[PDB]
Design a protein around this ligand. Structure first.
Ligand SMILES: CN[C@@H](C)C(=O)N[C@@H]1C(=O)N(Cc2c(OC)ccc3cc(C(=O)O)ccc23)c2ccccc2OC12CCOCC2
Ligand SMILES: [Zn+2]
Length: 83
């Protein structure tokens, strides 16, 4: 087709949810919320990445939401625009 996910293996929400097995205990956003916004854990710090656009998000701050940070930084993501 005309679009293509950066990371096809993380197409699935369940696969993204599994990536957070070792999400650090200081990272306040839940794997549920992050996976639901297309994000999976890169294994490094609190850095997640979008399966669709490939955008990365890290150094999360209080009051950050997954979807709002995803949209803010990566507004042309097909996942963000398809939601
Ligand atoms: C406050 N909410 C958090 C999620 C946030 O916005 N984090 C940014 C954040 O996640 N981004 C997104 C982002 C980008 O947004 C367009 C672009 C490239 C990025 C590259 C890396 C990386 O090499 O690891 C990480 C993030 C990138 C960001 C955007 C613009 C300037 C700096 C950015 O980096 C930080 C802010 C400083 O520490 C590194 C992460
Ligand atoms: Zn995205």
């Amino acid at each position: 087709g005309t679009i293509y996910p950066r990371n096809p293996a993380m197409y699935s929400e369940e696969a993204r949810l599994k990536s957070f097995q070792n999400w650090p205990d200081y990272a306040h956003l839940t794997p549920r919320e992050l996976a639901s916004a297309g994000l999976y854990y890169t294994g490094i710090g609190d850095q997640v990445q979008c399966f669709a656009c490939g955008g990365k998000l890290k150094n999360w701050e209080p009051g950050d939401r997954a979807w709002s940070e995803h949209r803010r930084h990566f507004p042309n993501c097909f996942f963000v625009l398809g939601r």
